[PDB]
UniProtKB/TrEMBL annotation:
It holds the Pfam family PilZ. Residues 2-84 form the PilZ domain. It comes from Pseudomonas aeruginosa (strain ATCC 15692 / DSM 22644 / CIP 104116 / JCM 14847 / LMG 12228 / 1C / PRS 101 / PAO1). 3',3'-c-di-GMP 2 binds at residues 4-5, 8, 31, 36, 73. 3',3'-c-di-GMP 1 binds at residues 2-4, 8. This is PilZ domain-containing protein.
Amino acid sequence: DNQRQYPRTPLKCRIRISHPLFGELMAQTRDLSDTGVYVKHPDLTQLPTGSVVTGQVQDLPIDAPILQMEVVRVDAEGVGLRFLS
Ligand SMILES: Nc1nc2c(ncn2[C@@H]2O[C@@H]3COP(=O)(O)O[C@H]4[C@@H](O)[C@H](n5cnc6c(=O)[nH]c(N)nc65)O[C@@H]4COP(=O)(O)O[C@H]3[C@H]2O)c(=O)[nH]1
Ligand SMILES: Nc1nc2c(ncn2[C@@H]2O[C@@H]3COP(=O)(O)O[C@H]4[C@@H](O)[C@H](n5cnc6c(=O)[nH]c(N)nc65)O[C@@H]4COP(=O)(O)O[C@H]3[C@H]2O)c(=O)[nH]1
């Protein structure tokens, strides 16, 4: 029954989410796998599915990677994102 290719573990960090038209905001992750991340913020919950956002974790010693992510789903609290190839 498990349809996840990779397991998810809790991870909470500050992440900047940006989109060319919708603008940017600072959110927090909730959980992570090798293929995707859930990002919690009320203002993300109306992103269309298929939106492509960039995310970059904040406040790391090193500059974090800037990741392209697809919005695969929204819920009451945020969005499920999949990292792009
Ligand atoms: N479309 C979509 N929705 C997603 C995805 N991941 C989470 N959700 C949504 O978020 C709810 C809560 O997920 P959860 O806390 O991981 O809590 C999950 C998790 O513990 C487990 N679960 C369900 N399906 C899977 C699965 O394929 N693999 C694993 N490992 N757990 C699953 O059952 C709980 C309840 O599942 P749901 O009733 O389905 O309720 C899910 C579903 O509505 C996803 O990749 N795609
Ligand atoms: N960390 C994280 N990543 C997320 C979340 N929601 C989506 N993703 C990412 O987006 C991918 C594709 O999600 P999907 O198209 O809904 O495709 C999902 C969905 O159809 C199903 N699925 C997995 N978990 C659940 C679940 O809890 N409930 C339901 N209903 N479906 C699930 O299995 C497919 C493949 O799941 P994955 O291989 O995990 O692949 C997931 C994962 O990399 C989330 O809450 N947290």
